[PDB]
Design a protein around this ligand. Structure first.
Ligand SMILES: Nc1nc2c(ncn2[C@@H]2O[C@H](COP(=O)(O)O)[C@@H](O)[C@H]2O)c(=O)[nH]1
Ligand SMILES: Nc1nc2c(ncn2[C@@H]2O[C@H](COP(=O)(O)O)[C@@H](O)[C@H]2O)c(=O)[nH]1
Ligand SMILES: Nc1nc2c(ncn2[C@@H]2O[C@H](COP(=O)(O)O)[C@@H](O)[C@H]2O)c(=O)[nH]1
Ligand SMILES: Nc1ncnc2c1ncn2[C@@H]1O[C@H](COP(=O)(O)O)[C@@H](O)[C@H]1O
Ligand SMILES: Nc1ncnc2c1ncn2[C@@H]1O[C@H](COP(=O)(O)O)[C@@H](O)[C@H]1O
Ligand SMILES: Nc1ncnc2c1ncn2[C@@H]1O[C@H](COP(=O)(O)O)[C@@H](O)[C@H]1O
Ligand SMILES: Nc1ncnc2c1ncn2[C@@H]1O[C@H](COP(=O)(O)O)[C@@H](O)[C@H]1O
Ligand SMILES: Nc1ncnc2c1ncn2[C@@H]1O[C@H](COP(=O)(O)O)[C@@H](O)[C@H]1O
Ligand SMILES: Nc1ncnc2c1ncn2[C@@H]1O[C@H](COP(=O)(O)O)[C@@H](O)[C@H]1O
Ligand SMILES: Nc1ncnc2c1ncn2[C@@H]1O[C@H](COP(=O)(O)O)[C@@H](O)[C@H]1O
Ligand SMILES: Nc1ncnc2c1ncn2[C@@H]1O[C@H](COP(=O)(O)O)[C@@H](O)[C@H]1O
Ligand SMILES: Nc1ncnc2c1ncn2[C@@H]1O[C@H](COP(=O)(O)O)[C@@H](O)[C@H]1O
Ligand SMILES: Nc1ncnc2c1ncn2[C@@H]1O[C@H](COP(=O)(O)O)[C@@H](O)[C@H]1O
Ligand SMILES: Nc1ccn([C@@H]2O[C@H](COP(=O)(O)O)[C@@H](O)[C@H]2O)c(=O)n1
Ligand SMILES: Nc1ccn([C@@H]2O[C@H](COP(=O)(O)O)[C@@H](O)[C@H]2O)c(=O)n1
Ligand SMILES: Nc1ccn([C@@H]2O[C@H](COP(=O)(O)O)[C@@H](O)[C@H]2O)c(=O)n1
Ligand SMILES: Nc1ccn([C@@H]2O[C@H](COP(=O)(O)O)[C@@H](O)[C@H]2O)c(=O)n1
Ligand SMILES: Nc1ccn([C@@H]2O[C@H](COP(=O)(O)O)[C@@H](O)[C@H]2O)c(=O)n1
Ligand SMILES: Nc1ccn([C@@H]2O[C@H](COP(=O)(O)O)[C@@H](O)[C@H]2O)c(=O)n1
Ligand SMILES: O=c1ccn([C@@H]2O[C@H](COP(=O)(O)O)[C@@H](O)[C@H]2O)c(=O)[nH]1
Ligand SMILES: O=c1ccn([C@@H]2O[C@H](COP(=O)(O)O)[C@@H](O)[C@H]2O)c(=O)[nH]1
Ligand SMILES: O=c1ccn([C@@H]2O[C@H](COP(=O)(O)O)[C@@H](O)[C@H]2O)c(=O)[nH]1
Ligand SMILES: O=c1ccn([C@@H]2O[C@H](COP(=O)(O)O)[C@@H](O)[C@H]2O)c(=O)[nH]1
Ligand SMILES: O=c1ccn([C@@H]2O[C@H](COP(=O)(O)O)[C@@H](O)[C@H]2O)c(=O)[nH]1
Ligand SMILES: O=c1ccn([C@@H]2O[C@H](COP(=O)(O)O)[C@@H](O)[C@H]2O)c(=O)[nH]1
Ligand SMILES: O=c1ccn([C@@H]2O[C@H](COP(=O)(O)O)[C@@H](O)[C@H]2O)c(=O)[nH]1
Ligand SMILES: O=c1ccn([C@@H]2O[C@H](COP(=O)(O)O)[C@@H](O)[C@H]2O)c(=O)[nH]1
Ligand SMILES: O=c1ccn([C@@H]2O[C@H](COP(=O)(O)O)[C@@H](O)[C@H]2O)c(=O)[nH]1
Ligand SMILES: O=c1ccn([C@@H]2O[C@H](COP(=O)(O)O)[C@@H](O)[C@H]2O)c(=O)[nH]1
Ligand SMILES: [Mg+2]
Ligand SMILES: [Zn+2]
Lengths: 304, 48, 115, 217, 108, 152
RNA sequence: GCUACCUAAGAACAGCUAAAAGAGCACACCCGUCUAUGUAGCAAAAUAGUGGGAAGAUUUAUAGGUAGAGGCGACAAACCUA
């Protein structure tokens, strides 16, 4: 007999558990708002060859952004909700060549997760997260499990690797899944309009692996590479990312610094372990900008 | 001030009260005829 | 946009431009890697049995936002060397031609109006 | 009171925090220049700097035929057939190359989209470029002029005779004949205007927007 | 297309006996508190719903009796009343329909 | 792809979906509880919820009368919409309907459902009433909200 | 009793333009140009649209007649119970 959390509760105990467990989520989220006044791991400066932990954000949508050369740059919104680091995995047992950290975001219901998953967060003292991503790091950057991660971890002018599951399209055919040309409509052509043509040759008595034939579109993890941050809203935790991000609106992404050789070495000015708001030195404004962006509130741009 | 629709059957439904309105829209055409020859035509046009 | 054999209009004070009878010039080529021709693209043009190079100045196709979307596909005529055929241009011409690559300073000295 | 269309969020599954962040950048731009009440029948003179010249301004006058675009990239498209030739510029409302926008004649036509003026006569769409703005009245109703246009013959750009467009700005009767009045009424589709879930009931949403507007001042 | 060679007893034996083609054992099932006929979760009782609808039948039978014929519908809210009862002062001024059985224990 | 679309396509077309919900909503104003399949109840359920919202605009509204000639197939339920159902849900702002799932039909084994207007002349349908406050799990957690009330 | 032709005595052919037209448009009807569906199909030859004729060398009901070294044929060496 499959159960759920709310199977035997009366109408007098349904609002209590709705209030109490959500207050437990808000208490543990507000107990973890001080990384530096707790005991952290040591801070190290940036070195050539060092990598940094990323974030998990939600894609709100896009608004247009205009630059001082007078061209429109579409910018997607990448809003970071409740980003905490959950686990550290060392150099020796990481099954790779870089070490890793695990980070989760989008706190979800504690009633709708497996008991093996819930014992992880119950040790940490955190609400359970929706999606857990693993970031390759070096040993220079190592952050204790439990610190919050904010939007000002990144900075404007920084190029960013973003990946998520793309919009699934179900079982699709030929001219939509792979963009082939198909057959003409009229001039004979009785039942061939969106049909795959020849698959292989005659001497091949089979079909090769990896041939393009109808199957399920989308719902795979794709990465877009080299996307500039133009702007950061610190108040609502917004990353303003250039172009389009894989996935639908209100979806969870993986926000990593770029892999591109020209765009992966320039990391001197970036705050290296994370960004810590408890440092209390030069508190960041409402909105951090790039050089080329137009300020909403700056006057009309005159090119003379 | 509130013009309610009048409570009748519909002309196109398949029932017995909708049949009786379809009888009356025939019986409106007998009332609206000009000559007696037009009345005698539509009163005896459907051979049953 | 302008593919092969669209009907366009020549906006020039030429003696070759005021064509009687079949008063609709038909293009035969676009000088791009696509068939698609935009504002400031060379095309060929067949006028009165004579094939002639031409330059797209505004089209009926919606392009970028603050650029005009002219209700007639109007095209100026040039020869192979690059200067225009005519002496005056009376139609409006967009000012998007200056930045774009090509012999377009020849055209903008002929336009009477810049809208 | 007039609430401009772009402040209304389109029906969708977008998070309302996206449109709250959008409305902050809408209202900071509106401090720079004044955006007047301009309708679909309004005539506007828009001055814009552009990066194509050496830094001059361009004043383009036109009829604001179509005012869609729902967000920070709100657009409006103007028409002029100056020197006998049609000019069609889609002006983005919040682009920072605009300096000032003003209305010449603040009026409204019977139709929500004047895209049919492409297929109308050019006499009903030409406008004097150096013409003075009309004197405005402070608190009265906006003027609606029933200036139902006459068109060119049957091969139009779009099938405006169909009732899916719902055009109420054509004198249809003298340019189109009665048999192809009836054939266009075959696409009447009378169930749409009686419907409930294809009607986006937006009355509650303006209360939060107007709360946001006046709290920004 | 036609089969080049016939499908044998073993290949059918695996295919029509797969757990995907085998029907699933459902765990959706409870016993009703009131009547005792075993119901399912997330649906109503088949016995209790047939109890109400067959009780609804003689109630709606009498609605057609007090009008007689079509296109005659009340403009007043209505209360059903069983035997051994009086109309209340809230029930004064309604169309009160009477079916001659005792008041059922599930009706309130 | 139907990401987006909330309209089940039914009937023999988009005209025929409207008329089949028009007929189904009308029996919900006369009999005030009806039986229909899941795709036909839940399509019609929103139109039943906004029937009363358009019936609370008043007797004298032209628009509430012009949709009433369409959306009620019969013409004598037009008084019943504006004078029985509308003053009954006068205080309420939403949720005037009650949709519950019925055991399946004998013919096509259809996932059928019962829909009514909340409060009626009819006998009460056996709506699923949940567990009492006197059980083992309630009384253990009644001590939770009784202890934590004294923590202020 | 299908069909090819024939005999007997019958029937049908709106409206429109024109006048006594194997005339024009166009129904009912007759035929089957092209396409699509269908191809163990609804159908051992159909359906939907588009088409040809539709007062005539027309179409059609009924009864009769010609029978295989034959009949019949505005010859397709077609048709004569798939
Ligand atoms: N019933 C239903 N199933 C869906 C829908 N979208 C996705 N699915 C299911 O999820 C699978 C994968 O979809 P993604 O969009 O790739 C589909 O093949 C289907 O089984 C939907 O709208 N309705
Ligand atoms: N249908 C079809 N036509 C073919 C084929 N091979 C050649 N053709 C030729 O193609 C042309 C068009 O035939 P379809 O009916 O469209 C005809 O001339 C026909 O002879 C084939 O395999 N199928
Ligand atoms: N799949 C495929 N096979 C081809 C093509 N052209 C040739 N072949 C192969 O080459 C053989 C001989 O080609 P010829 O052009 O007939 C074919 O039988 C086929 O196997 C092609 O365009 N596609
Ligand atoms: N309405 C729906 N019903 C069932 N599965 C759905 C669904 N909407 C989304 N999904 C699932 O979520 C995946 C991602 O959604 P979308 O296609 O981006 C889909 O491929 C499908 O597996
Ligand atoms: N493997 C499979 N077996 C059966 N039905 C399938 C199927 N894959 C897809 N479908 C059908 O297609 C619908 C959508 O699947 P998805 O978008 O590929 C399913 O709800 C089902 O009706
Ligand atoms: N089974 C087969 N029967 C006849 N010809 C065949 C054949 N398989 C291939 N061919 C012919 O052999 C040639 C080589 O083509 P390949 O086998 O795809 C072609 O002419 C092809 O048509
Ligand atoms: N249904 C199918 N369609 C296409 N190719 C197939 C096929 N079934 C088998 N094959 C071909 O035969 C090969 C061997 O498959 P087998 O089931 O082990 C495949 O890799 C493929 O090339
Ligand atoms: N092989 C080819 N491919 C494409 N276009 C060609 C061509 N040969 C000629 N043309 C077109 O025809 C025009 C006239 O050339 P003609 O040989 O003079 C060329 O400028 C080019 O546009
Ligand atoms: N990066 C690139 N590599 C190759 N061809 C390109 C290219 N960018 C543009 N092109 C060519 O120029 C054409 C016009 O593209 P533009 O971005 O509108 C393209 O269709 C293609 O032929
Ligand atoms: N302009 C448009 N035309 C058609 N479908 C649209 C649309 N905008 C949105 N949709 C539909 O709605 C889905 C999500 O957008 P909507 O804001 O819920 C899309 O995936 C698409 O199915
Ligand atoms: N694919 C696209 N390319 C260019 N501009 C676009 C666009 N999608 C939207 N826009 C801009 O955004 C406006 C509408 O905003 P959003 O899509 O609600 C459009 O009028 C246009 O200015
Ligand atoms: N071109 C083809 N080649 C081989 N098998 C085919 C085929 N087309 C259909 N079949 C097979 O014939 C069987 C019946 O066809 P139906 O479309 O389900 C199926 O097993 C199918 O896979
Ligand atoms: N929280 C969310 N906000 C917006 N779109 C979402 C979403 N979750 C899923 N989607 C989108 O909606 C689709 C499913 O549509 P639904 O069944 O109407 C998904 O495939 C995805 O593209
Ligand atoms: N043909 C496409 C596909 C995607 N996109 C962009 O890419 C984003 C992510 O799409 P993916 O298929 O998940 C979309 O939201 C859209 O902005 C596009 O602009 N054009
Ligand atoms: N049942 C199958 C198996 C293979 N295939 C095709 O044959 C290819 C090679 O598969 P083999 O089993 O290695 C696949 O990638 C697929 O394209 C198929 O279409 N259907
Ligand atoms: N085909 C395309 C075009 C643009 N884009 C995205 O849109 C952004 C803006 O491109 P525009 O062509 O200026 C790109 O930087 C890229 O992120 C894309 O993903 N795919
Ligand atoms: N119940 C809903 C959900 C979405 N929508 C909107 O409609 C769009 C697509 O459907 P159209 O209204 O046909 C969605 O993207 C969303 O904006 C709606 O109208 N009703
Ligand atoms: N998705 C979009 C949206 C707009 N556009 C362009 O932008 C113009 C303004 O549209 P807005 O949505 O108001 C359109 O007329 C079209 O030219 C586009 O090409 N693609
Ligand atoms: N909120 C609910 C309600 C019912 N259920 C029941 O549990 C069944 C699913 O259990 P299994 O994990 O498949 C549902 O079909 C329903 O009977 C549930 O899990 N959660
Ligand atoms: O190519 C694009 C995509 C979106 N946008 C902007 O982003 C907004 C996102 O809208 P959607 O419906 O999520 C859109 O309304 C435009 O303002 C562009 O300007 N260009
Ligand atoms: O199986 C599930 C999971 C979630 N939900 C609903 O989604 C809500 C949020 O779940 P998440 O995992 O945070 C939850 O409180 C329920 O209302 C279900 O109804 N069923
Ligand atoms: O840990 C929890 C549990 C429930 N909830 C919310 O409580 C509501 C009901 O919980 P569910 O059925 O899991 C729903 O709105 C959830 O999002 C939380 O936000 N956090
Ligand atoms: O021009 C060609 C020739 C063959 N083919 C494919 O190759 C197959 C074998 O062709 P061969 O001529 O035997 C044929 O069935 C097609 O699938 C093409 O697609 N195009
Ligand atoms: O155009 C061609 C010709 C041959 N082939 C291959 O080469 C094989 C031998 O072709 P030849 O023409 O004999 C043939 O069986 C195919 O596998 C192609 O794939 N494409
Ligand atoms: O049984 C199968 C095997 C492959 N496929 C399709 O063929 C594609 C290539 O498969 P291979 O094994 O590489 C795969 O992505 C599917 O779209 C099927 O649809 N069914
Ligand atoms: O023909 C092909 C198709 C894909 N691939 C690669 O295989 C991987 C898996 O793609 P899919 O799942 O078939 C991916 O890395 C592709 O680039 C090939 O190597 N060859
Ligand atoms: O056609 C395109 C354009 C951009 N992109 C990706 O988007 C990134 C940003 O491009 P923009 O045009 O600035 C680029 O670096 C690529 O990763 C594509 O993949 N394809
Ligand atoms: O039009 C484009 C742009 C980028 N890309 C890919 O994206 C990569 C990053 O491009 P960006 O513009 O930095 C580039 O190296 C290509 O692999 C394309 O394939 N096409
Ligand atoms: O071309 C074919 C098609 C089917 N079959 C046989 O028919 C069986 C079922 O056909 P399908 O999958 O519907 C398959 O498993 C084969 O045994 C063939 O042998 N050849
Ligand atoms: Mg067009
Ligand atoms: Zn029961």
């Amino acid at each position: 007999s499959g159960t759920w959390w709310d199977e035997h509760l009366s109408e007098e105990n349904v609002p209590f558990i709705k209030q109490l467990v959500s207050d437990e989520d808000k208490a543990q989220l507000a107990s973890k708002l001080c990384p530096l006044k707790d005991e952290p791991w040591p801070i190290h400066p940036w070195e050539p060859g060092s990598f940094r932990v990323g974030l998990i954000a939600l894609k709100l949508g896009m608004m247009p952004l205009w630059t001082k050369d007078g061209q429109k740059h579409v910018v997607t919104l990448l809003q970071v909700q409740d980003c905490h680091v959950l686990k550290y995995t060392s150099k020796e047992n990481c099954n790779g060549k870089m070490a890793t950290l695990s980070v989760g975001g989008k706190t979800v219901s504690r009633f709708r997760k497996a008991t093996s998953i819930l014992e992880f967060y119950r040790e940490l003292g955190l609400p359970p997260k929706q999606t857990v991503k693993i970031f390759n790091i070096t040993d220079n950057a190592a952050i204790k499990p439990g610190t919050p991660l904010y939007a000002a971890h990144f900075r404007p002018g920084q190029y960013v690797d973003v990946t998520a599951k793309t919009i699934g399209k179900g079982f699709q055919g030929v001219m939509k899944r792979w963009g082939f040309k198909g057959q003409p409509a009229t001039h004979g052509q009785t039942k061939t309009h969106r049909r795959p043509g020849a698959v292989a040759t005659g001497d091949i008595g089979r079909v090769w692996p990896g041939t393009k034939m109808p199957g399920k579109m989308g719902n795979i993890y794709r990465t877009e590479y080299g996307l500039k941050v133009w702007r950061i809203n610190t108040k609502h935790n917004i990353i303003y990312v250039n172009g389009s991000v894989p996935g639908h609106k209100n979806c969870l992404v993986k926000v990593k610094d770029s892999k591109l050789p020209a765009y992966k070495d320039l990391g001197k000015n970036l705050p290296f372990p994370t960004y810590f708001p408890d440092g209390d030195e030069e508190e960041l404004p409402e909105d951090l900008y790039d050089e080329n962006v137009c300020q909403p509130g700056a006057p009309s741009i005159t090119f003379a | 001030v509130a013009r309610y629709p009048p409570i009748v059957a519909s002309m196109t439904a398949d029932s017995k009260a909708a049949r009786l309105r379809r009888i009356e829209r025939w019986q409106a055409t007998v009332h609206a005829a000009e000559s007696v020859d037009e009345k005698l035509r539509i009163l005896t046009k459907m051979q049953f | 946009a302008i593919q092969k054999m669209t009907r366009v209009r020549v906006v020039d004070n030429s003696a070759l431009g005021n064509s009687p009878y079949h008063r609709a010039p038909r293009c035969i080529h676009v000088y791009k890697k696509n068939g698609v021709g935009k504002v400031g693209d060379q095309i060929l043009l067949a006028i009165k049995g004579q094939k002639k190079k031409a330059l797209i100045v505004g089209h009926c196709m919606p392009g970028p936002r603050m650029t005009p979307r002219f209700d007639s596909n109007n095209v100026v005529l040039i020869e192979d060397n690059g200067n225009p055929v005519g002496t005056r241009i009376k139609t409006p011409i967009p000012t998007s031609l200056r930045k774009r690559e090509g012999e377009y300073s020849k055209v903008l000295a002929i336009a009477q109006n810049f809208v | 009171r007039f609430l401009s269309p772009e402040f209304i969020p389109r029906r969708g599954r977008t998070d309302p925090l996206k449109f709250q962040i959008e409305r902050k950048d809408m209202l900071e731009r509106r401090k720079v220049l004044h955006i007047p009440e301009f309708y679909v029948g309004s005539i506007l003179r828009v001055t814009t700097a552009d990066p194509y010249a050496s830094g001059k301004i361009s004043q383009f006058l036109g009829i604001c035929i179509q005012r869609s675009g729902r967000g920070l990239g709100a657009t409006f498209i103007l028409r002029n057939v100056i020197e006998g030739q049609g000019v069609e510029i889609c002006f983005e409302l919040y682009n920072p190359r605009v300096q000032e926008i003003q209305v010449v004649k603040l009026e409204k036509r019977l139709d929500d989209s004047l895209l049919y003026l492409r297929d109308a006569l050019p006499e009903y769409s030409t406008f004097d470029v150096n013409m003075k703005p009309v004197v405005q009245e402070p608190n009265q109703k906006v003027p609606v002029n029933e200036l139902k246009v006459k068109m060119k013959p049957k091969p139009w750009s779009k099938r405006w005779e169909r009732p899916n467009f719902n055009i109420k700005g054509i004198r249809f009767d003298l340019c189109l004949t009665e048999q192809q009045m009836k054939e266009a009424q075959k696409w009447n589709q009378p169930w749409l205007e009686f419907d409930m879930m294809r009607e986006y009931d937006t009355s509650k949403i303006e209360a939060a927007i107007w709360k946001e507007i006046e709290a920004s001042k | 297309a036609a089969p080049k060679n016939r499908r044998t007893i073993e290949v059918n034996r695996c295919r029509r006996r797969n757990p995907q083609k085998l029907i699933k054992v459902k765990n959706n099932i409870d016993v009703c508190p009131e009547c005792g006929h075993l119901k399912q979760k997330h649906v109503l009782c088949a016995y209790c719903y047939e109890k109400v609808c067959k009780e609804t039948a003689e109630i709606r039978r009498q609605i057609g009796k007090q009008e007689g014929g079509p296109f005659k519908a009340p403009t007043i809210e209505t209360v059903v009343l069983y035997t051994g009862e009086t109309p209340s002062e809230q029930d004064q001024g309604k169309r009160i329909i009477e079916r001659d059985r005792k008041r059922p224990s599930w009706f309130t | 792809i139907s990401h987006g679309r909330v309209f089940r396509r039914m009937g023999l077309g988009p005209e025929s979906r409207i008329h089949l919900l028009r007929n189904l909503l009308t029996g919900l104003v006369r009999h005030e509880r009806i039986e229909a399949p899941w795709a036909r109840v839940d399509e019609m359920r929103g139109y039943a919820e906004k029937l009363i919202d358009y019936g609370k605009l008043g007797d004298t509204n032209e628009r509430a009368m012009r949709m009433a000639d369409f959306w009620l197939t019969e013409k004598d339920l037009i008084p019943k919409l504006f004078q029985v159902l509308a003053p009954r849900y006068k205080d309420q702002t939403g949720g005037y309907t009650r949709m519950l799932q019925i055991p399946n039909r004998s013919l096509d084994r259809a996932k059928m459902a019962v829909i009514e207007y909340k409060g009626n002349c009819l006998p009460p349908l056996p709506l699923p009433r949940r567990d009492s406050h006197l059980t083992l799990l309630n009384q253990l957690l009644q001590g939770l909200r009784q202890d934590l009330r004294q923590s202020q």
